[PDB]
Each structure stands twice: as structure tokens, then as C-alpha cells.
Amino acid sequence: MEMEKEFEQIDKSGSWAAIYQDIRHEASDFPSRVAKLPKNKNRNRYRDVSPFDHSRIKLHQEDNDYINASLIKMEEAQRSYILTQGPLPNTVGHFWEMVWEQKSRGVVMLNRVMEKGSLKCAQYWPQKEEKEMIFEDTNLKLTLISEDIKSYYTVRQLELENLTTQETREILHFHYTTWPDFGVPESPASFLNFLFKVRESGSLSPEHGPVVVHCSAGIGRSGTFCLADTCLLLMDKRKDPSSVDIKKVLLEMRKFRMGLIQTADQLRFSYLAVIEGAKFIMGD
Ligand SMILES: O=C(O)c1ccc(OCc2ccccc2)cc1
């Protein structure tokens, strides 16, 4: 079926939970043996969210190459994404090592450091120009260059230096700051505006390594971001945009990381975002 009318048909029939459970039943199951080794326990935030072995990002280190991060490679859309958990106190150096080694231009953050009165990820970037951060375990230096605070999101320019070689690179930090502590946003308009700002920066384009996107577990909000982006790109590429099937795209993405889209409300919100976004790309 088309998307917008499938949407109203699920609303009128109130069957979002049943649709979402079908997706959960049909989703791929692949091994995640490296994630579960005892030496990696303090590298995982949640015991039930792990990267598959076949798609995990490897650190370029011989001691321990493990990080909780996955490469989502979308062949028809010609887009790749790295989805990862919010960094932990003992993985902030690994996180920036990955950004460096994978040649990423941008980092997309979809959570606040504290939500619901608890810490959802480490404070992993510097908050003042004159107070830079050094990660001694991976030999990297990180400096805040500039910061632009808007009503729904903040963009930061950061300088990452590899202290072994003295090479430097400019990284863009795109921080969506207004996702509610509970539920999903009422309108997708600010989330879509944010996606378009990431696109306009070059961070999603083939001349760079894959964008790094995270929330707390790296599957829920993060899944919503890449699902909406890929669906909108396919609607632009194909002769028949009504052939784009958001449930089939989501199942393709779940071949590369488990659990993408965590609730039926996140699934409904993803439909809403793609539907409204497709009108702006052209005009209604
Ligand atoms: O009739 C439909 O079922 C439909 C028609 C057009 C359409 O395209 C939306 C779009 C998105 C992004 C760029 C250009 C067009 C999607 C679905």
C-alpha cells in the first residue's frame, strides 16, 4: 500500500502495536559473540543491545578492537551510517578513535546528557574554547572552535588532532536538544528541519566517511533518523515514489543492527516524518 493512506488505516483501526510486533518477529537474528566476551562488559551500556559481529566497527588496535557500534550500509539509497551508543566514561577515547579512523565529518547526537534525572551518556566534548580535552588512551586532542545555539538544536565546530601524527580535522557536532523525556514529538517539523541541516553540511555525503549517530542505546531515536533519511532519498531516486515501503526499509536496516525503532510510537512518528518530509521536498 501507499504510505499516507496505510497510515490513516492504521490510525483508524488502532493497530500500531500489532504492526510493530510483526516487525519484531520478522527481524534478523545474527551472532554478537564479540560484544558478549567478559573483557567487554564495561564497554556496553545495556546488556540487551549489542552490535552483530558481521557489521560491527573495529577499532584499529591489536589489544582490544571492540566498540558498541554498527555500520548500516544502504545499497540502493547509496548512504551509509554508523549507529552507536552514547559513550561511557571508559569509552570516550574509543569513540573519538572511531570518528578519526572512519574519516567521519559529522556526529549526530539525539539525547541530552541527563534525562529523567539520570545520566544517558558521558560529557564527551569540551564546553569552553580554552578548556580542551585530551584522551590519553587513544592519543587524541579535542577543542571546541565555535557553538551556535538554536531553539531546537545546537551546532558545534570541533577540532580533532591525532597527537601521534599532528594531523588535524574539523568535525561538526549536530545536537538535537528537544526530544521529550517521554514519548515522541507531537510534530515532526523540527526533527525534519534538523535532518535537512545535517544534509546541507556535507556530513552525509560520499566524499566523507559515514556519519556517526547516537542516542543513549543507539537504536531508537537513532533508528528514526536514518530510517527517515533513507526513505526520503529513495522517494527522490525512484520513478514511482509511492513504491517506497517503510516497513521493508526498516527490516533491511535491522540486518545491520538489532532493535532499530524501540516502540510503536517511534514507528508511527517515523511514518509521520517521511509523509510530511515528502511534501516539502517538492511543496504541500
Ligand atoms: O503517491 C505516493 O504514494 C507518493 C508520491 C510521491 C512521493 O514523493 C515524495 C518525495 C520525497 C522526496 C523527494 C521527492 C519526493 C512519495 C509518495
Check which CATH number belongs to the domain holding 262 and give it. Answer: 3.90.190.10
- The count of domains in the chain is 1
- CA 277–ligand 1 middle distance (angstroms): 9
Cα 106 versus chain centre, distance: 11
Cα(225) to ligand 1 centroid in Å equals: 18
Closest residue by Cα to residue 81 from 227, 185, 264: 227
Residue 185: which domain range? 1-284
Q: Three-class SS of residue 181?
A: coil
* Buried b or exposed e, range 4-38, using 16+ CB within 10 angstroms: beebeebeeeeebeebbeebeeebeeeebebbeee
**H helices of 72-188, where?**
92-101
Nearest CA to ligand 1 atom 14: 236
- Residue 174: how many CB atoms within 10 A of its CB? 21
**Contact (CB, 8 A) for 151 and 84:** no
Distances (CA, A) of 259 to 29, 83, 84, 100: 10, 12, 12, 27
Resolution in A: 1.7
Neighbour count for residue 185 (Cβ, 10 Å): 16
For ligand 1, is residue 2 a contact (CB within 6 Å)? yes
- Does the Cβ of 281 fall within 6 Å of ligand 1? yes
226 catalytic residue (yes or no): no
Residue 271: all three cell numbers together: 511514518
Experimental method: X-ray
